[PDB]
Amino acid sequence: VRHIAIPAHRGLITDRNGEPLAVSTPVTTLWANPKELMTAKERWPQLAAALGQDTKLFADRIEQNAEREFIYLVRGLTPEQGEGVIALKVPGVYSIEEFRRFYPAGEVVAHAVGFTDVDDRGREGIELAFDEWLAGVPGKRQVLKDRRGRVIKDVQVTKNAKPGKTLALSIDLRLQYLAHRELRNALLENGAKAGSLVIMDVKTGEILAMTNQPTYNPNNRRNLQPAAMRNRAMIDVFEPGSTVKPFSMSAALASGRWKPSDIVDVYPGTLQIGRYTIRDVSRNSRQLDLTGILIKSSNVGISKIAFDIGAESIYSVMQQVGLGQDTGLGFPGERVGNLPNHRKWPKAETATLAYGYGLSVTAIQLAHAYAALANDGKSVPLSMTRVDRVPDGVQVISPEVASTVQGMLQQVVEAQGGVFRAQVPGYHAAGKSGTARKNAYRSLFAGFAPATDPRIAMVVVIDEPSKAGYFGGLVSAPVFSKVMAGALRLMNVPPDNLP
């Protein structure tokens, strides 16, 4: 080794507004030439103490490595701590300017921003996904070692350590803080195991917030269990249940055979498909219109519509909105989930698909799907980075069918017997709850607002609420209301519910 690489300054990660999220902070690494340290043995106890180390263990280490010309003493200390060891004037001890990451928002954006390893290389989240952009390239400086390893002179500074590039995230730190606090509070109040909350800008494909509970302080990574490190919104796959019925309804409305005032008979709240029985959660209905099917979350109702239209039209919509499909985000450990397909769709698979059983999705897929519906049936590619020029997007559902589904979803939140807990102060809000049985449950609420001209889509996933109430509308809906209210206010969205 006659040439050494100067660690590059890792690029700044900021939120959409330039609020710092990952900052490269100067640190100092101490290394030694054992052949030189072996000539200053009386100095070892002073040095042993200065680096923390036990006196005899430190000496054993230098005696074993006595023939080597380089070893690390201690990596990434505070510059002043490094200074304090250099000030001892121990022959063979040399310093290196190094970089370590500091995460100002800490636990609030841990899962999204991720973290770097010992070597300042991206390991998790955005740190890894954008490692090439962030890392830059180290620089080579020529050194002059006589023979014993003693540095005489820096001959030629050929290549300079090119710093990493800045990266602005789509995340709004104000919305992220609001989402994190409200999800944390919901978990406490419901005695929940875990939770996820995703906020999307419907017009840009931007992830405005992505929070998971439990979270970790990335700055104090020691002791940590992977349960708090899981980026659940992108990794945890679940059956979306009744939250996918608006998509089955979109295929119904696009077929030409269905209108919202159409009536379905769901009595007695059960439907036998030979060996299999479709069962409604509440079984006190007979005739329901299409909005009623969504309000009462009738699996029987949607299965009957599904038999009429075919599972092919339902599969298509779900697939086009991104459920069980690649998000193109390239995040570490990102699960794609599953949208089963068939040549010939059997009656049982048709029903289960219509009501969200069998298929598995991520919180991120569900939010993106709701964003397409909120964005007048137009799907915009997902983004974790600030979007300056909006991509063209794909018309996945017709503007008219999307507008009708929106009105129905507004009625799911507003109408008698609906999800009144999702209601947003001064705005019309639209959405659908879900309760997936795992005897444990996953509480879901997906929606968007203002129901008039939608701006933001939101998915709230509450994993295992241990209180008497577990339905998505009891558990996840009040979280949506609070976070949606705060987000509409922060983005200065005009109210649509005035006289």
Ligand SMILES: *C(=O)[C@H](CO/N=C(\CCC(=O)O)C(=O)O)NC(=O)/C(=N\OCc1cc(=O)c(O)cn1O)c1csc(N)n1
């Ligand atoms: C939608 O998510 C449905 C219906 O329940 N949804 C509710 C409950 C509130 C209410 O309407 O009274 C909501 O909107 O919050 N979810 C289910 O049907 C699921 N589980 O419930 C039990 C169940 C499961 C099942 O497979 C079945 O055929 C019948 N029942 O009763 C569910 C759907 S996917 C999954 N893992 N669970």
